[PDB]
Amino acid sequence: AIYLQIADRICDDILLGQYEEEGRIPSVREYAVNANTVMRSYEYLQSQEVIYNKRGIGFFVASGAKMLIHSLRKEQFLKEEVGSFFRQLYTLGISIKEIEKMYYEFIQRQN
Amino acid sequence: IYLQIADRICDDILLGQYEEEGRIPSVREYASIVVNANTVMRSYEYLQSQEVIYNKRGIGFFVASGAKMLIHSLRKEQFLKEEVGSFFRQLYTLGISIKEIEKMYYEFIQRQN
Numbered sequence: 001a002i003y004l005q006i007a008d009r010i011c012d013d014i015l016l017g018q019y020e021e022e023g024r025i026p027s028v029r030e031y032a033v034n035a036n037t038v039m040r041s042y043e044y045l046q047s048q049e050v051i052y053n054k055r056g057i058g059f060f061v062a063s064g065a066k067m068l069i070h071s072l073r074k075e076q077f078l079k080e081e082v083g084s085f086f087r088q089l090y091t092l093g094i095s096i097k098e099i100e101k102m103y104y105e106f107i108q109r110q111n
Numbered sequence: 112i113y114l115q116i117a118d119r120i121c122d123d124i125l126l127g128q129y130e131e132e133g134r135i136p137s138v139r140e141y142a143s144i145v146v147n148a149n150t151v152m153r154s155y156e157y158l159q160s161q162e163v164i165y166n167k168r169g170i171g172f173f174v175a176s177g178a179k180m181l182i183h184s185l186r187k188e189q190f191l192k193e194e195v196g197s198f199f200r201q202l203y204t205l206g207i208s209i210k211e212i213e214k215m216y217y218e219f220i221q222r223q224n
Contacts, residue, residue, distance in 0.1 A: 033139065
């Protein structure tokens, strides 16, 4: 959903040190091909402590929102997918000794 | 669809319509000229995680340097899994020699020529 299809399109350019932690970020009017729902985007991200507000000044990345943001998407994976995914190895007759085989060998690919 | 697009664009690409290290226009724009927009998201993922393309962050997508050729191949190797099997079976069933069908791939080539 785009309330959150955008709230996730921001926390990343922070993990990339493009937006410095406790360094600033963009006027919405300017992040305007849409700036309407954005108010519900920035919403998500404020109520998620990812960013903060100076009265009349503008907008920064909350420090260690690098680390504030890493943390959020973790429990929205072990809640989200794992629980079915656990329940699939189950139904399928696959084991963790066979899955931590293909995983430890799965790094070979990315190096 | 998820896919069809790849071809209109790839053929844009093999037509050199889009240069390698050169830009394809917005996922906003292209869907007008053709008329849906968000299923045009389900494509550039497939493409840029298939390496025929990439998105400079905050600029757009580009042709990947060496694009015109992986395609031909992935066009070539896709002939090799579900398009070719469809065939050897028959040249087997109906009683067709290999050098049988081969005869008429060389008259084929001659008309091109």
